Design a protein around this ligand. Structure first.
Ligand SMILES: NCCOc1ccc(-c2cn(-c3cccc(C(=O)O)c3C(=O)O)nn2)cc1
Ligand SMILES: [Zn+2]
Ligand SMILES: [Zn+2]
Length: 231
């Protein structure tokens, strides 16, 4: 069964195989006095591994590199932060330390720099205007417009029909907004319907935090964000 939050110390990283060559990584952090899940993706790319997002901080992420090798034994050579928050770039430092080439939209690097969060080295051109999509190794990267953050990207694995929406998508257990400090609440339902239009194929849908679902995660997220909008 996919892991739930209370099973994972603030330091233990679980790997959850989602298909041949596709895993998710699951870590936990403390924030607001409380303890939260966080998902990221691992995609095999021939001989190497593409990482999507950090494990939320340098400790967790050095740890996350150590499951992968222990459990998968393939080198992580590239990594993508899907937006500028710490649960995504927390431990880019680390990854670069180990030789991982880090990447991020130019929108994400600038807002990370403005924010005092770590900065991916490379820039992921071709993702600026809403609807922009580019190909990155075994997956597709999509910029659905402002939502959870103005920079958020979302990731699609054709090979297994996995759609990783990160923090732009909520799990079903999550009924209420939670951190929208950097959200474009007006655009978020829209930015999201695109994700629906441009990836109807997706059987597995991972959110930034919590239990994967199918595409009803999207409609649930819109419901949450709209509810939130009206107070
Ligand atoms: N001095 C201004 C502070 O600026 C900050 C902005 C954002 C964050 C931050 C929220 N994180 C989250 C923690 C729990 C849940 C979530 C979520 O996806 O809903 C997030 C988040 O990514 O917003 N991660 N990092 C932390 C600090
Ligand atoms: Zn965020
Ligand atoms: Zn998040």
């Amino acid at each position: 069964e996919y892991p739930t939050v209370s099973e994972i110390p603030v330091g233990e990283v679980r790997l959850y195989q989602i298909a041949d060559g596709v895993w998710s990584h699951i870590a936990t952090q403390s924030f607001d006095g409380a303890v939260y899940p966080s998902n990221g993706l691992i995609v095999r790319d021939g001989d190497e591994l593409l990482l999507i997002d950090t494990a939320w901080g340098a400790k967790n992420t050095a740890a996350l590199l150590a499951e992968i090798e222990k459990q998968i034994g393939l080198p992580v050579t590239r990594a993508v932060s899907t937006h500028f928050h710490d649960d995504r770039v927390g431990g880019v430092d680390v990854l670069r330390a180990a030789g991982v080439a880090t990447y991020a939209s130019p929108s994400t690097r600038r807002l990370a720099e403005v924010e005092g969060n770590e900065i991916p080295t490379h820039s992921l051109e071709g993702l600026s205007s809403s609807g922009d999509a580019v190909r990155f190794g075994p997956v597709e990267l999509f910029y659905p417009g402002a939502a959870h953050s103005t920079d958020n990207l979302v990731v699609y694995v054709p090979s297994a029909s996995v759609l990783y929406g990160g923090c732009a998508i909520y799990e079903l257990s999550r009924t209420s907004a939670g951190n929208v400090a950097d959200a474009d609440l007006a655009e978020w339902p829209t930015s999201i319907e695109r994700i629906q239009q441009h990836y109807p194929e997706a059987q597995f849908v991972i959110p930034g935090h919590g239990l994967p679902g199918g595409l009803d995660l999207l409609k649930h997220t819109t419901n949450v964000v709209k509810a939130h909008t009206n107070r």
